Design a protein around this ligand. Structure first.
Ligand SMILES: CC[C@H]1OC(=O)[C@H](C)[C@@H](O[C@H]2C[C@@](C)(OC)[C@@H](O)[C@H](C)O2)[C@H](C)[C@@H](O[C@@H]2O[C@H](C)C[C@H](N(C)C)[C@H]2O)[C@](C)(O)C[C@@H](C)C(=O)[C@H](C)[C@@H](O)[C@]1(C)O
Lengths: 148, 198, 247, 396, 50, 49
């Protein structure tokens, strides 16, 4: 959180890239490090079992989890099989604008997504947004200086 | 062999917590290698213009990583283990003279030679919306030895800074001077390749 | 009410004095709008080894059931559904099969000039297509647009095999007046038994190298070629065994 | 058969034909570093202008994301339009693309990218090569950008390839925090504490979790947006100096305006700048591959290492098993036909039968204007099969 | 069960972001189990000195 | 461990990769058996032990 692209690359991508190297039937590795986030796609040879690739990647990253900075260790690394297509996209919109986007996302995550996971054949259900409810403490620098 | 490796890692995951901090910081590597040398590859400089440490670093950057991608190679390593590393050679006679311990050096290097997180300037929610969103980039990890010797351990009673150069000698040296690889009468880092199981 | 500091008096300095606390989102970098209205898209990746149409129908019904309990002003929509493409392709493959069967009946009623003969393709073709489906399922192949295209292709192979067998029976029947229907059928089958096996093996040997081709284009080729080979082999067996008896 | 060769040469070769998928992907990119509110105003105007035309039914937008380079760049928004239907709409997707392109060339305030959705997912298009210029000397990405730009300038002159683009961009503004370590040590501070203060005020600092609705939710600390919007927001930030003295943050820190890359890219554990390109007409994908490889070798020597990904990697690492398998199949067909006919010579007629079907297919596909396609080859497979079946019976 | 454990571990990996911090610190363990009790072995001290 | 042995504090950036920073005393001082007579450690008080 709140780290520029270069530091994220050097501090996070490099250890993970070092540890992941040598995984069975890996053709090449592509990683991008946008502000605040570092995605690393590990492509493999055709015919390799996706679950096997995922679990080996898990083992390699669990080996080097400790080298990562404190914030990245706090927000653990997620390993998924990215070979998936979109069956469909369901958009939940507040036509009257009664609720802002945050309320819509939280309601969808709490209520809608669980039923989608219940539907047979729905292997993965996800919401594009990234607005989870969070306790925000808005510091006022003037007040902080006033009270020391 | 793959299933055996997965089960071994699954059972190991629990015990990694009980390990000391340094051990997990270095990390625990679980491979399928048989620990039997399949072959030895020696990289030797004929013109001898390239020192052993630089040969090893070249190998570990270019050759070793590509070799580890080759299927059927369980693990590939070089004997020397002479990777690049800043070496802060402390002088105890100079350390006791200035009244700074090795702990004061460790704390200074850990605190100063690190990269932290800095947020973007113009970000929502903002009531006075700026035209542009500007990220903040910092560099706290020093690259050159001249930057490392300028690390300030302690500030004297006046505006004079005690620095690592006064109490230590800083240079770019090998990670370990324990081992050495020799081919015929030449100096060459040997690449031992361990066959993956099955 | 978190106490940052304790003053010299019994009163405490708290976070409320220096900051404002509210429940907000983790991130404000993104925002989703549908038709100029705030919205949140949701993605549903189809599980491996499942049926797209049934899953899409279940998703739609579950969305309706949840929309019964939606908060006021909340409505759902499904902009993208790959199930539409596969349903259209399935409908088109069914229409192509029906049109091909009708054309086979018409062409055989025209040239062969017999009405009872039209029944023979009507049984022979569906049996071989069903066998192709069964063997496709055994190999683990999945129904997809490429597979449906290759099925459209295989329709021609199956109808052509039925045409050759039935036409040979009729030609031998009309060559000799004395010959009986069973004897004409056995004579025609004796003439074209080994040829049919030769075509089946030749077509399989033609289609196999295409499957060996690697790459994404190689796999796309492999789908068509493998279902085509399955269909020609099964159609050859059917024309060898079932079609002469019905003839 | 000579005319077959001519017709094959004249016909264009493409991997997959473009098909209307019933929705239209719109990629909107504001100038680098533009605020999110400007992007929202732009996409609001975009949807409003798209509302008039009857062909689109609904619009789905994802402000704050870049579909091309998965990211949350606030200057890029993706707005997918939903066409009304295939039957109820008189215009194809291409005409809608043309109308939306023509509406939007004049303003030049919001860059417009109207592209039909990819026929199949994860489908490389036009067989383009994915070059990765892995820098090996550890140079800064700004210098990597100039070296790569020299590479593109050399490559544009080359006849084998055309339309080269580089994803790496350094135009994004970035304030550079210059730390005067002497002053910060003088004030008896620690770098870790001052950067915790920065991450707490300017950035988002995540401390613990608080439960709501039974789910564990983050607790985030950030300064009010009114104070951190200005460039000189450091002066309001204060950090204790371990001597019970408030030390202003601007005393030892300074923001200077600079340009840096928003997203970095590492390929095979090495910094790189991805380079895409499409073969020029009349040239194979492989020829463009060696051409761009030679260009990279000339422009960058012993400091950058070439790399391949996707289709380019498949072509580079191809073992040529397809041609070998085809030869095996041809031999097997020859043998099986010779066995059926009990004569070695006669299968030649069965083989020479199929050029007629191939000739008809290529002639009609040339006349129709349709280019060589994957589906064309699939149909040619059945064509060869049926022609061989007819010839076998004639011969027998 | 060998592949079932793999699928479970991969899903926990994919959902790691959803987990609370404490169970992220103490690594979640996925292991095959069996409800069957094949036998019960009892060890006792005859002299009762232990 | 910082004087006699090697202490790995953190990593510095070089050639794109990250390389360790190791702290150790000079080989002369840790050579002898009586190495401990040279290293001094500061207590809670300012005294060096
Ligand atoms: C992230 C979130 C997005 O997911 C993706 O990025 C996927 C995985 C793209 O592939 C990813 C693949 C990836 C990661 O490959 C390295 C990267 O290129 C980008 C992100 O697209 C795909 C296929 C896009 O095609 C891509 O459109 C881009 C504008 C250009 C890209 N291609 C020309 C370059 C092309 O394939 C496509 C089909 O339009 C997206 C459709 C499904 C959507 O509308 C949905 C809502 C997406 O916006 C998304 C789920 O929000």
């Amino acid at each position: 959180t709140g780290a520029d692209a270069q530091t994220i690359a050097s501090t996070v991508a490099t250890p993970i890239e070092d540890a992941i190297n040598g995984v069975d039937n890996m053709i090449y590795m592509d990683s991008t490090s946008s502000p605040g986030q570092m995605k690393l796609t590990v492509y493999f040879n055709i015919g390799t079992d996706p679950d096997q690739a995922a679990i080996d990647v898990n083992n390699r990253i669990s080996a080097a989890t400790a080298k990562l900075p404190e914030a990245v260790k706090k927000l653990g690394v997620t390993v998924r099989k990215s070979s998936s297509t979109i069956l469909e996209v369901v958009s939940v919109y507040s036509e009257d604008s009664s609720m802002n986007d945050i309320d819509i996302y939280n309601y969808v995550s709490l209520n809608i997504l669980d039923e989608l996971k219940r539907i047979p054949g729905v292997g993965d259900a996800s919401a594009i947004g990234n607005k989870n409810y969070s306790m925000r403490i808005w510091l006022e620098p003037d007040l902080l200086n006033k009270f020391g | 062999p793959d299933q055996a490796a997965i089960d071994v890692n699954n059972r190991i995951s629990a015990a990694t917590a009980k390990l000391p901090e340094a051990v997990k910081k270095l990390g625990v590597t679980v491979r399928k290698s048989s620990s039997t040398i399949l072959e030895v590859v020696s990289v030797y400089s004929e013109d001898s213009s390239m020192n052993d440490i630089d040969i090893y670093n070249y190998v570990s950057l270019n050759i070793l990583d590509e070799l580890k991608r080759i299927p059927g190679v369980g693990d590939a390593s070089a004997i020397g283990n002479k990777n690049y590393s800043m070496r802060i050679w402390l002088e105890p006679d100079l350390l006791n003279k200035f009244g700074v311990t090795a702990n004061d050096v460790i704390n200074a290097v850990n605190d100063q030679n690190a990269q932290y997180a800095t947020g973007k300037i113009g970000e929502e929610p903002v009531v006075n919306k700026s035209p542009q969103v500007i990220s903040i980039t910092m560099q706290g990890r020093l690259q050159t030895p001249q930057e490392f010797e300028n690390i300030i351990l302690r500030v004297n009673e006046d505006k004079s800074f005690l620095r690592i150069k006064d109490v230590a000698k800083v240079e770019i040296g090998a990670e370990q001077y324990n081992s050495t690889g020799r081919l015929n009468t030449s100096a060459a880092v040997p690449i031992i390749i361990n066959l993956q199981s099955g | 009410n978190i106490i940052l500091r304790v003053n010299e008096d019994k009163s405490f300095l708290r976070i409320k004095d220096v900051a404002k606390v509210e429940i907000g989102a983790e991130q404000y970098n993104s925002t989703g709008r549908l038709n100029t209205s705030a919205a949140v898209p949701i993605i549903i990746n189809l599980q491996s080894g499942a049926n797209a149409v049934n899953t899409a129908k279940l998703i739609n019904e579950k969305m309706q059931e949840l929309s019964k309990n939606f908060p006021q002003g909340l409505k759902y929509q499904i902009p993208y559904d790959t199930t539409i493409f596969v349903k259209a392709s399935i409908k088109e493959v069914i229409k192509t099969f029906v049109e091909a069967l009708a054309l086979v009946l018409v062409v055989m009623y025209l040239f062969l000039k017999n009405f009872k003969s039209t029944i023979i393709p009507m049984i022979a073709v569906p049996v071989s297509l069903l066998g192709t489906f069964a063997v496709l399922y055994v190999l683990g192949f999945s129904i997809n647009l490429l597979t449906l295209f290759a099925l459209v292709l295989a329709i021609g192979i199956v109808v052509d095999d039925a045409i050759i067998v039935v036409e040979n029976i009729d030609r031998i029947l009309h060559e000799d007046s004395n010959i009986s229907v069973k004897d004409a059928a056995i004579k025609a089958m004796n003439e074209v038994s080994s040829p049919v096996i030769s075509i089946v093996l030749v077509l399989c040997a033609v289609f196999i190298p295409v499957s060996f081709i690697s790459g994404f284009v190689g796999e796309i080729q492999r789908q068509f070629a493998l279902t085509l080979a399955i269909s020609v082999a099964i159609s050859g067996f059917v024309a060898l065994t079932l079609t002469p008896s019905l003839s | 058969i000579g005319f077959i060769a001519y017709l094959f040469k004249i016909v264009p070769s493409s991997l997959v034909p473009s098909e209307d998928q019933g929705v239209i992907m719109s990629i909107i990119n504001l100038p680098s570093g533009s605020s999110i509110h400007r992007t929202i105003e732009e996409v609001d105007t975009i949807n409003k202008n798209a509302t008039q035309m009857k062909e689109i039914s609904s619009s789905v937008s994802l402000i704050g994301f870049d579909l091309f380079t998965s990211s949350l760049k606030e200057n890029a928004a993706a707005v997918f339009f939903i066409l009304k239907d295939w039957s109820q709409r008189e215009a194809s997707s291409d005409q809608i693309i043309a109308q939306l392109f023509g509406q939007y060339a004049a303003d030049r305030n919001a860059l417009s990218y109207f592209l039909n959705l990819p026929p199949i997912p994860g489908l490389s298009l036009t067989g383009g090569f994915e070059m990765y210029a892995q820098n090996k000397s550890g140079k800064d990405y700004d210098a990597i950008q100039q070296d790569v730009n020299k590479m593109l300038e050399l490559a544009r002159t080359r006849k084998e390839l055309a339309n080269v683009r580089t994803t790496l961009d350094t135009s994004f503004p970035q304030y550079k925090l210059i730390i005067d370590r002497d002053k910060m040590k003088y004030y008896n501070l620690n770098m870790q504490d001052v950067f915790n203060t920065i991450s707490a005020t300017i950035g988002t600092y995540y401390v613990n979790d608080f439960p709501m609705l039974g789910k564990n939710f983050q607790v985030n600390i950030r300064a009010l947006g009114d104070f951190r919007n200005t460039q000189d927001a450091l002066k309001n930030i204060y950090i204790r100096s371990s001597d019970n003295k408030m030390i202003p943050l601007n005393s030892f820190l300074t923001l200077v305006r600079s340009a840096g890359p928003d997203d970095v890219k590492r390929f095979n554990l090495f910094p790189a700048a991805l380079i895409q390109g499409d073969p020029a007409p009349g040239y194979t994908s492989g020829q463009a591959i060696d051409a761009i490889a030679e260009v990279a070798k000339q422009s960058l020597g012993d400091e950058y290492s070439i790399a391949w990904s996707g289709s380019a990697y498949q072509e580079v690492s191809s073992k040529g098993a397809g041609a070998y398998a085809f030869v095996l199949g041809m031999i097997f067909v020859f043998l099986i036909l010779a066995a059926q006919y009990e004569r070695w010579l006669m299968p030649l007629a069965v083989i020479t039968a199929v050029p007629f079907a191939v000739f008809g297919s290529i002639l009609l596909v040339a006349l129709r204007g349709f280019d060589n396609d994957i589906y064309f080859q699939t149909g040619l497979l059945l064509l060869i099969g049926l022609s061989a079946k007819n010839a076998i019976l004639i011969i027998e």
